[PDB]
Each structure stands twice: as structure tokens, then as C-alpha cells.
Design a protein around this ligand. Structure first.
Ligand code: TP0
Ligand code: CL
Ligand code: NA
Lengths: 565, 565
């Protein structure tokens, strides 16, 4: 009926991929995975995975979504067997937006609080925060005793505003008792979901305009933070520990699960957002150049973000007493601790804080609307009734996201947020990208994919990209999944410990999306009325080429198809 | 499409409506309301409210669901402006379906525990019950004394078992800290919902056959319990106190408004279940005799169950050497705290303890199946897609009920259960039955409703039934609603007091169903196109009489319609 919708401008796609790719502000926590005796621990594995897995998977997803011109779930009409990975990545993006809207609400609350002339992080009083009053220690306001107290800095005005004034974490004991959702956080979440609905109910062109307006100057805040970090006298000590140039210090074997999760969140692999955005893209586009540009931009952004973060770390460690490693909270609120104290020192604390919070709101809204648009595109291409009624389905999705995010905005919502993020994100995106690589490279065929690319644009992927798609990336993803299943530590906060049932709940939430692949395989095997050979043929052959099943001509059965690279 | 299913035999429909009318509310509440409200003089208004206010509301649904063989919601095709109240009686049936099955779990977990020779409520200790350090005392063997009534004494083995060993309320403080759902009760709830799905997944065919067992065993259980209690020492005093005629009670407070609410919540007229059950019956079936027999069976069953209840209460009063007013209780305190404690002191306690709880299970199974089939039929006749997919829609409904009943089976779910029951049931179903009576007796017309009955069975209801449908029933429902609004008390438990925000959320849940009538009126007024008199005439006239609207012939705009009885 209605033709396939497309972008209004080609530059809109290159801006939207970055607006969804700008998550290195908050999700890039270097001191969390900081080194112990290795030096480079979150930059060597990050770059390695971006080189060997990031760019190949980005190019593969872009070309697949551009050629098939379908959603994440209906891209697997080229191999109906591995079609459960579409629902898997849809649930992945849904669970991710669930806690991403919480970060957006936190940023909105900080933006609303920063309007005051006196910032809430400039004194140790009752300035919109909730100090316990046991340790009202002004970092530079008054002289205090040099007591480390485990070198922990959680009584600073920034932390007292974050974990007590914004989150109200003191009222909740833990995951077992989360309390009631906060009213101000509820209003913030309602405003966020209303903005998302008003941005997404129109179409992809409105989302393109929104990512154009919001992502206009995200780099400027990072640039001014970096230029203020290194120019100030006492902030070089921490950044010196950051760029620890040790090529013979080794604490890991370049193996990290959090690095893979970070590259997948940055690029978008395992969420269906790349395929969904490539579906609306034009037929003739250089996905290779776009992938290289996106990877380079993400690498530079990660580098400058780590620079600024460790510069603020060293500034805190010099202007204050306790050491660098325990000065800030390593978790989902690292930037909320770092950036307010840094902006308090800089001139014009109110204006720059407002600008930084507007940037955070912009990037968060962009990423969340990208994920929600990917989910909507997938479930609309899957069910044409949902594609016809786009507004009702969008309203339903936004309302479900708002309802299922109340457990993350409550008194102890940060614990559920971290649990969901870690378990769901890591395990689900790992299994999803592994299954997608196995299906595209082996079952569908690297030769057929390369031929489709050559028919799409003149240039053909060389030996490097094909060998990465076929051998390097699937083996890497399988090894990461194995090291994640084996080397699994119990989920915990900086100080709070989770009961054993929280780990089981997280594993069950991950498995809910994981088992979506074998369930659909069994569904396809049982639905087809035929012999075992005919079932296996209908399983691993495209829908358009199903007639060849009747002609007894299947390429996957022969070993020449598998051996071909 | 294909014609809907029908009852193979009218005995199935009769037993189904009997099992729906006869539930746990006729065992724990009716005898206590009889005793407290003057003894025997409570039968004078009750039967009165049975005849003038309860019986005409039971003949109104069996004749509206048989002439218009539709669901609870879709039956409002004679007056679309009230179809919203057809949705409320569905949503209410969901709000009642969450906690009610929990009670069905309470009778299941007590059944398995009664499969041992030593019942868990016969002695003090850790016999499947969580005991206090030094608080509990033994019922028999102590002649020290007592200064408090045994109805609220929570230091007995049975009460402590019911609270801590079953509900686990000792490790909870209120709705703010409910805790995690009990797995030993989650398994019982799973078994209950599985039985419900297996009964209702293939239509009325399997439900009618399950009712043949689940609606005939409770009568045998009551018969054997009465024939055993009539020989128990001390039952004569209980029978005399239950049948004591005290005509001194002439006050409206608790004597004239308690029999009305008891009749209303015992007969079940206006819940939407009767419209669904009467939609699978033949067009020539007599609804008059069916309604009369159902009301008489309900009232006689309540009256004869009061005999066994008070025989057990008199036996316990003689054993405890206390008066009957001290061992007089209602609700779960009777069937779970008072009756098992009395069975403990009987001979062959295993048989009686198994048969009492299997009667309690059979009483709840019929009511839950009816309340769920009401929603099923109301949503299937409205949405034609759900008619073909019944085995999936019933499964979805059961799974949603199970997931939304996890807040009542937890360590502190009794408070949420009481909140839901009281607010939702009372307020929403009262407003719903009031709107239904107003729509059927005034807007549609009692003369047309009598002509429909005359076309169905051949005879037309006399002037008494029309007078009790047009004037008596609406005024009675309005009086009950006004009393419920005025005599509304703040939510409270035995000792715990609900927070101020509990009353507001309870009222919100109650209004969620009640606002569906004005919202649907506005929706119907805005959807229809034309002038005000052309949009109003399309919501008060039947869909088969809309052509008369084009001919400027509307009967609801004349004085003869409103002044005809
Ligand atoms: C026992 N007769 C009187 C009806 C009792 C049963 C229910 C019930 C039970 C289980 C599931 C749904 C429902 C919906 C109908 C309703 C409405 C108000 C109060 C109670 C009830
Ligand atoms: Cl009754
Ligand atoms: Na029953």
C-alpha cells in the first residue's frame, strides 16, 4: 500500500547515526574498569574490538539493512531460521531505553536545579539536597582534618545532591526494599516520554530534525572541559595516571566484556537501530565510508571523554585530600559526581552547567528515540496492522516504557538500573550479535552478501572485511560469550551487595531474550508441513527462493557454499 | 460466522449460576451478619431485599442476555451510550480476579498441609508455622484464664499459622514494604490458574462439566458438617443464638443497610457474569423460574451453612468455656482461623480438614471461572478477532491475572488484597449496577424489556416486576451507593493503619472503572457526526432502529416513554 518512507536529507542519516552513537558521555566509565597493574585496560581492548569487530559488524548491519530494506526482525527473511534475534534485539533496545529514560530524567532534574544562581553543589547546607549531617565536609570551603575514611568521597555536595537529593537512595535499603517512586522523578519521566512521543509519532523526518537540532554542538562541551582540564595547574596529575604509557604492563589479555558492551552501545550493534536506520536509507550509499567515519568519531569521542574524566579526577585528587581511585562513584552516576564539581570551579558555573545538562538531555533523548524508533520499525514491519496504526503503537510503547521504568526511578531504583543494564545489555547483545554473525556469514553466506554489496555499489569488500565477517568476528563473539558465562562475578554496587536471587532474576531476564532464537527455530520446524529435508531447506533458504526447495536445489547443503569465502 | 456454542443441558446452566451465586461470601459473612443484626430479625429485611431488590435484578440479566445473546460489554446495542458500563463490569471483574484467586490459593495450601495425621495447627512449634520466641500459648491444657476475646487473639496456633506460616506477615510492615512473593503460594496460584485455563479454554462445554463436580460437592460437605455438628456438645447454644428472634433492631444503622449489601454481594446480580451465562442458552428457555430457583438455592444454602458455622462456633465456645459472642468472627478468621482450630479438636480431624478445604476450593473455583468467563465473553463479542483465538486469549487473561496477583501473595499482600476488594468491588460494581439499571429501565424502557420476555417465553411479566425494575431497583442501588459514599471509613486492618496515600490510590482504582461511562459517552458523542440532536439520538436508540432516526422518529424524546411502566 504505502511506499517505503525515506529520509529527507542524506546528511540527516549521518547525523542520526552519531546522535544515537553519542553515549560515551555517561556509559564511558574508565575508572570503573580502570587498571590495577596493566596500565591500558579500557583503551587497548576498546580499540582492538572496534577494529576487529566494531567496523565489520557496523558495515555488515548497514549493508544488510540497506539491501533488504526491512526491519531488524524482517531482515531475517533471508534466513527465517535465525529470526528470533530480531525479537531479541528489539527486547534489548526496549530494556535499554527502560533505564536510559531514567538517565534522561536525572539530566532533566539537574538542568532544572541548575537554574538557581547558587548551585546546589557549592555549599554543605540544605541547598535542595539531603545531607546526613554526619560529615558536612566542604572540599575547599573550610579547613578539615586529613582523614581518608577508606579514601571514600560520598559526602561532597555533588554526591549528597546526587544520591540523596535526586535519587533518595538513603530511604531504600536495597533491591529487596525499593520503596516508592519519587514524584519529581515521576514528573521528569513523564516529560521525557511525552517529548519522545511527540518526536516519534510523526515519522522518521521529525526524528531527523530532532537529532539535527539537539546534536548540533555536543562536542563543544567536551572540548571546553578538556581545555579547562589541562590548562589548570593541578589537574595534570590524574591525566598523567590516565595516559600510562606501558607497553609491557599486562593485567588482562585484551579480553573484556564491558569493552564489547561499550563498543556495541556506541556503534549500535545488537540493538537493531543500525538496520532500522539503514532501511529508510537510499539504495546507493557508501556504507563503508560511513562506518569508518562513525568508528573514527566514536574513538575520538571516547578518547576525549576519558581525557576529561581523568582530568577532573586529578583535579579532585589535587584540590582535595583523598586519592583519585576512590574520589568518585564508579557506576551509572559517575558524570553526575564529576562534572558539577568541575563546573563549580570554572567561571560562570550556572551557564556552563546549564549547557552541559542541555547536552546530556539532547544526547539521551536522541539515543532513546533511536532505540524506540528501531523497536517500532521492527514491530511494524513484522505486523502491518502496527505499521498502519503508528500513533497508537507508539503511544502504547511509550506508556509501557514509562510504566516499566518506575522500578528504576524509585528510592532504590539505581540498583535495578545497574542490574538490568549489566545483565540484559551484556548477555543479550553478546548472544544476539553472535547469532547474527553466524546467520549472515555461515547460513546466509559471505559470498552472497558480498555479491549483494557489489550489486548495491561498485566497490566490493576485500579479503579483510569478509574474513572478519566469517572467521574473526564470530569466533571473537563466541569467545567473549564463553568468558562472560564462565568468568561471572555477582552483581554489586560500590558498597551494596545483592542477594543471590537478584543474580537469578538478571539471568532470567537475559535468557528471556536469549531463548528467542531457538524458540523461533522450533516454531519454523514445526510449522512447515514436510519431511526433514524440506523443513531444513525452508529453514535456511530465503523466502523469495523457496520455490527452489521444490526443485531440490539448495546451496547450503553442498560444502562448496560453506567453504567459499 | 459460525453460531456461538450453547449449553448442552439446562442443568449445566442452572448448576453454573448456582455455583456462581454460592461462594465463600455465603459462609463467613452471612451467619455473622445474621447474628449481629438481631439474630433472626435479620431475615425480615434480607428476604425483603431478596424479593424487591435482589430478585428483579436477577431476572433483568437472564432476560437481557438471552434475548440479546451477547457479552457483558456488547449487549449494550439497544443503547450505545451505556456500553461503557459494559466495559467497567469487565475491568471490575479483573480487579476482583486478582485477589480472589489468592483466597483460592489459601484453600489449596491448607489442603496439602491437611494430608498429614498431625495437622500444622494442632500444637505450638515450628510445624510449618513461624513461631514467636515466647509469645504463643497452647489452646488446650491451660486453665490460667483469658482477658481478651478469642476472635482477635493472634497468639493461637491456628491464627499464628495462618498469618506467619502462610501469609508471612510477621516479616512485613505494610504496603510500603510488601516483600517478595511466597513461592509456596506462587505454586498454588499457578495450579489454580492452570485449572482455570484448562476449564475455560474450550468454551462453556468444559466449564459446564467441571461445574457438575465443583457445584455439587460443597452441598454434601455442608450436609455432613451439619449432621456431625448437631451431635457436638455445645452446638445447641449456638443454634439458639443464631435463630434468636429479636425484633428490637429497628435502626437503619447496620440492620437495614447490611442485609441490602449482603443480598447484593451474595446473589451476584449486575456483575456481568449473568449476562455471559445467559448468552449461551436457548431462546425458548424460561428465565423466570431459573432466576427464582437460583435466588432460592443461594438463600437456602446460606441459611443452612449458617447452621454448621454456628454449631462449630458453639462447640468451640463450649470447649473454650467462653460465650458465643467472643468466638464470633467473619471472613478469613472464620474459615481459616476458627474452623480448622475447631476441626483440630474433633475425631478423625484429617477427613474433616480435607473435606472443609475442598469445599472452600469448590466454592471459589466456580466464582473465579464465572468472573473470568464474563471478561472472556465481553472481550470476544466486542473484538471479533478474539472469538477465533480463544485458547490463546484465555491463556493471556490467565497469565495477566497471575502476574497482577503477585502483589497479594507476597509477605504483605493481605493489605493490597483488602484495598482492592473493598474499593474496587464495592464502589465500582455499585456504580456499574446503578448505571445498568438506569440504562435498562429508563433509557431503553421496561415495556420493551417486557415485550422481549413475552416474545421469548410467551408470557409478559406483571406490573410488580416492572415496578421493581423501573423504580425500586434504581432507588435501592442509589441508596446503597449514597450510604457507601457517606459511611466510607478510612482503610484499616486489625492493628495496622493504612497510610493517607492508600485511600487515594484505592479511590483511583475504584474510579478507573466508574469513569469509563462518561468517557465512553464523550467518545460516542464525538465519534458520531451530525448535529447535537442527531448525535444524541444515535446513543439512546438501538443499532437496529437507527433508520427511524433518519425518519425523525425517536421514542426517547416523548413523554410517553418516560411515563410508561
Ligand atoms: C460470588 N458472586 C456473588 C460473585 C463473586 C465473584 C466475583 C468474581 C470472582 C472472581 C473473579 C471475578 C469476579 C467478578 C465478579 C465480582 C464482582 C464483585 C464482587 C465479586 C465478584
Ligand atoms: Cl447471601
Ligand atoms: Na461456587
Amino acid at each position: 500500500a504505502q511506499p517505503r518512507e525515506t529520509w529527507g536529507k542524506k546528511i540527516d542519516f549521518l547525523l542520526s547515526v552519531v546522535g544515537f552513537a553519542v553515549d560515551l558521555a555517561n556509559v564511558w566509565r574508565f575508572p570503573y574498569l580502570c587498571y590495577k597493574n596493566g596500565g591500558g585496560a579500557f583503551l587497548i581492548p576498546y580499540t582492538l574490538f572496534l577494529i576487529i569487530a566494531g567496523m565489520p559488524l557496523f558495515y555488515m548491519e548497514l549493508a544488510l539493512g540497506q539491501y533488504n530494506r526491512e526491519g531488524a526482525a524482517t531482515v531475517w527473511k533471508i534466513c527465517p531460521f535465525f529470526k528470533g534475534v530480531g525479537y531479541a534485539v528489539i527486547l534489548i533496545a526496549l530494556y535499554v531505553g527502560f533505564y536510559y529514560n531514567v538517565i534522561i530524567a536525572w539530566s532533566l532534574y539537574y538542568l532544572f536545579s541548575s537554574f538557581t544562581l547558587n548551585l546546589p553543589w557549592t555549599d554543605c547546607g540544605h541547598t535542595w539536597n539531603s545531607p546526613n549531617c554526619t560529615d558536612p565536609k566542604l572540599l575547599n570551603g573550610s579547613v578539615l582534618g586529613n582523614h581518608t575514611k577508606y579514601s571514600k568521597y560520598k559526602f561532597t555536595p555533588a554526591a549528597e545532591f546526587y544520591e540523596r537529593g535526586v535519587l533518595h537512595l538513603h530511604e531504600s535499603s536495597g533491591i529487596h526494599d525499593i520503596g516508592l517512586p519519587q514524584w519529581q522523578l515521576l514528573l521528569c519521566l513523564m516529560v521525557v516520554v511525552i517529548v519522545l512521543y511527540f518526536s516519534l509519532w510523526k515519522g522518521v523526518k521529525t526524528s531527523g530534525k530532532v537529532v539535527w537540532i539537539t546534536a548540533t554542538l555536543p562536542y563543544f562541551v567536551l572540548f571546553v572541559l578538556l581545555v579547562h582540564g589541562v590548562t589548570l595547574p593541578g589537574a595534570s596529575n590524574g591525566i598523567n595516571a590516565y595516559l600510562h604509557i606501558d607497553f609491557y604492563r599486562l593485567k588482562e589479555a585484551t579480553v573484556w566484556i564491558d569493552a564489547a558492551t561499550q563498543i556495541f552501545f556506541s556503534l549500535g550493534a545488537g540493538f537493531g537501530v543500525l538496520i532500522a536506520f539503514a532501511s529508510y536509507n537510499k539504495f546507493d550509499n557508501n556504507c563503508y565510508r560511513d562506518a569508518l567515519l562513525t568508528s573514527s568519531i566514536n574513538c575520538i569521542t571516547s578518547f576525549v571523554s576519558g581525557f576529561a574524566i581523568f582530568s577532573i579526577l586529578g583535579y579532585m585528587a589535587h584540590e582535595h585530600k583523598v586519592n583519585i581511585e576512590d574520589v568518585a562513584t564508579e557506576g551509572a552516576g559517575l558524570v553526575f559526581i564529576l562534572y558539577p564539581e568541575a563546573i563549580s570551579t570554572l567561571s560562570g558555573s550556572t551557564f556552563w552547567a546549564v549547557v552541559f545538562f542541555v547536552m546530556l538531555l539532547a544526547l539521551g533523548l536522541d539515543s532513546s528515540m533511536g532505540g524506540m524508533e528501531a523497536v517500532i520499525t521492527g514491530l511494524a514491519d513484522d505486523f502491518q496492522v502496527l505499521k498502519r496504526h503508528r500513533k497508537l503503537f507508539t503511544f502504547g510503547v511509550t506508556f509501557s516504557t514509562f510504566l516499566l521504568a518506575l522500578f528504576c526511578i524509585t528510592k532504590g531504583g539505581i540498583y535495578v538500573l545497574t542490574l538490568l543494564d549489566t545483565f540484559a545489555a551484556g548477555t543479550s547483545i553478546l548472544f544476539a550479535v553472535l547469532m547474527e554473525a553466524i546467520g549472515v556469514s555461515w547460513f546466509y553466506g559471505v559470498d552472497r552478501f558480498s555479491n549483494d554489496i557489489q550489486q548495491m555499489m561498485g566497490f566490493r569488500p576485500g579479503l579483510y572485511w569478509r574474513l572478519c565477517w566469517k572467521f574473526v568476528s564470530p569466533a571473537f563473539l563466541l569467545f567473549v560469550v564463553v568468558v562472560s558465562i564462565i568468568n561471572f562475578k555477582p552483581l554489586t554496587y560500590d558498597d551494596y551487595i545483592f542477594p543471590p536471587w537478584a543474580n537469578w532474576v538478571g539471568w532470567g531476564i537475559a535468557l528471556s531474550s536469549m531463548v528467542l532464537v531457538p524458540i523461533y527455530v522450533i516454531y519454523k520446524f514445526l510449522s512447515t508441513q514436510g519431511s526433514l529435508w524440506e523443513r531444513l531447506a525452508y529453514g535456511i533458504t530465503p523466502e523469495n527462493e523457496h520455490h527452489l526447495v521444490a526443485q531440490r536445489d539448495i546451496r547450503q547443503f553442498q560444502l562448496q557454499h560453506w567453504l567459499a569465502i
